[PDB]
Amino acid sequence: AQTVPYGIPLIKADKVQAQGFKGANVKVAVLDTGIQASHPDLNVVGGASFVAGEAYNTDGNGHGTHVAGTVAALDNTTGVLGVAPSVSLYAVKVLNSSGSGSYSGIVSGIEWATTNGMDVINMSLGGASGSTAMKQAVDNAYARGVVVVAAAGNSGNSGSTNTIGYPAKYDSVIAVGAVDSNSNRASFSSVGAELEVMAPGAGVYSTYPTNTYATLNGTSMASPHVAGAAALILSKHPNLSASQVRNRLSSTATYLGSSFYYGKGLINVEAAAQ
Ligand SMILES: [Ca+2]
Ligand code: NA
Ligand code: NA
Ligand code: NA
Numbered sequence: 001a002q003t004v005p006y007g008i009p010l011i012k013a014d015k016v017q018a019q020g021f022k023g024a025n026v027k028v029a030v031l032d033t034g035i036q037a038s039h040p041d042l043n044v045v046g047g048a049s050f051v052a053g054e055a056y057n058t059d060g061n062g063h064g065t066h067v068a069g070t071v072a073a074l075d076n077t078t079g080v081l082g083v084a085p086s087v088s089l090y091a092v093k094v095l096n097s098s099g100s101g102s103y104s105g106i107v108s109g110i111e112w113a114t115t116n117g118m119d120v121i122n123m124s125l126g127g128a129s130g131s132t133a134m135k136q137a138v139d140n141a142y143a144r145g146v147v148v149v150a151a152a153g154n155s156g157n158s159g160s161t162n163t164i165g166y167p168a169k170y171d172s173v174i175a176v177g178a179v180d181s182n183s184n185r186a187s188f189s190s191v192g193a194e195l196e197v198m199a200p201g202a203g204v205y206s207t208y209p210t211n212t213y214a215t216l217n218g219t220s221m222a223s224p225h226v227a228g229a230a231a232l233i234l235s236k237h238p239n240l241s242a243s244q245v246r247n248r249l250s251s252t253a254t255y256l257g258s259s260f261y262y263g264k265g266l267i268n269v270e271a272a273a274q
Contacts, residue, residue: 003213004081006181007070007200007225012270013083016232017075021273023084023231028071028120029113030224031106032064033099035091036209041079042068047091048112050105060097062208066216067124069207070224071231080206080213083228083269084235090118095125103131106167110137114144119234122227123150123167124220130166142172147230147242151219152177153190157261162192168219169194174246177263178202178222183254185261189219195263197253199225229269236273248272 008014029047037044037057042065049056059065068089075085094109095101106125113121114137121141141148152175153165168175168190178189178201186202201222208214226249233245240248252271253264 002077002079002081003205005205007204008081008083010183010200011083011225011229011267013228013232015270016236016273021232021236022075022086023228023235024086025088026084026120026231026234027088027090027118028122028227028231029090029092029118030064030068030071031092031094031109031113031121031123032067032125033061033095033097034059034064034093035068035089036065037091039065039207039209039211041073041207043074043089044091045088049093050108051093051096051101054093054097056091056093059209061099062214063099063124063220064091066206066208066214067122067220067224070204070221071122071228073207083225084231087231103134107133107137110141114141114146118146120147120149120227120230122224124223126151126153126165126168128165130169134167135170138167138170139172142242145242147245148173149176149223149227149230150174151223152195154188154218155190156188157191163190164192164194165190174226174249175263176219176223176226178219179266183256183266186217188217191261195259197226197249197263198222198256198266226267229267229272232269233273
C-alpha cells in the first residue's frame with residue numbers, strides 16, 4: 001500500500017492530482033546529496049555530480065533522496081506519493097555524503113540546471129553567508145525562466161534577528177519555511193523579511209536509502225513541497241513565466257500570522273493552480 005504523507009493533502013496537491021495534473025514533463029532539478037536512483041519509488045531521468053568521488057545517481061547521505069520523494073515519489077501501490085508524481089526528476093549532486101558543499105559546487109549545479117533547461121530548481125540547503133557567484137547564478141536562473149526554491153533555514157527565531165539563510169535570502173529565490181501537521185510553524189524554522197511561504201516541514205515522511213522510507217524534520221522538507229507545487233501549476237498552465245508561478249504560490253497562500261514568521265503563509269496549490 002502507498003502511504004500519503006500529511007503534507008500532500010495539507011497543501012492540497014491531491015486536489016490538483018485528481019484533476020489529472022501531476023507535473024508530467026516538468027523538469028525538476030534537486031540540488032542536494034544525490035538521489036538513490038535505484039529506489040523502487042523514484043525515477044531519476046538524468047543529472048550531474050559536482051562532488052568529487054560520488055556519482056549523481058547514488059546518495060550516501062539520504063537527504064537528497066528524501067527531498068526527491070517529496071517532489072516526486074511515484075504514484076503507485078507502494079511507498080509514498082510525491083506532490084508532483086509525474087515530474088522528470090534530475091539529481092544534481094552539490095552536497096557530499098556528510099551533507100555539505102562548496103559555494104562553487106552549488107554554483108556549478110545551478111548553472112548546470114539553467115544550461116540544461118530545468119523548469120524548477122530545488123535547493124534544500126543553506127548557509128549563513130552565500131556569495132557573489134551564487135547570487136548571479138540564482139538571478140540568471142530566475143531571469144531565464146527557472147522557478148528557484150530553497151529552504152529558509154533551520155535557525156529558528158531570536159528576538160527581532162533575521163535568520164534566513166542563503167540562497168533563500170536572495171530576491172530571486174523562494175524562501176520556504178516549515179509548518180507541522182497542525183499547520184503551526186515549527187520552532188526551528190528561520191524568520192525574517194525574506195521568508196516567502198510555508199510548507200510542510202516537521203514529521204515529513206518520504207523515500208530514503210536503501211529502498212525504504214523515513215521521517216525527517218527541516219525546512220529542507222518544506223522546500224520540495226513548493227518545488228512540486230511549482231511543477232503542478234506549470235503542468236496546468238504551461239505558458240506561465242517563472243515570476244507568474246511564483247506570484248501564484250505567494251498570493252494564494254493561506255495566511256497564518258505575522259509574515260516575519262510565516263511569509264504569506266501555507267501554500268495552497270489548488271488555489272494557486274486555479
Ligand atoms: Ca509510491
Ligand atoms: Na528507481
Ligand atoms: Na528569497
Ligand atoms: Na521570469
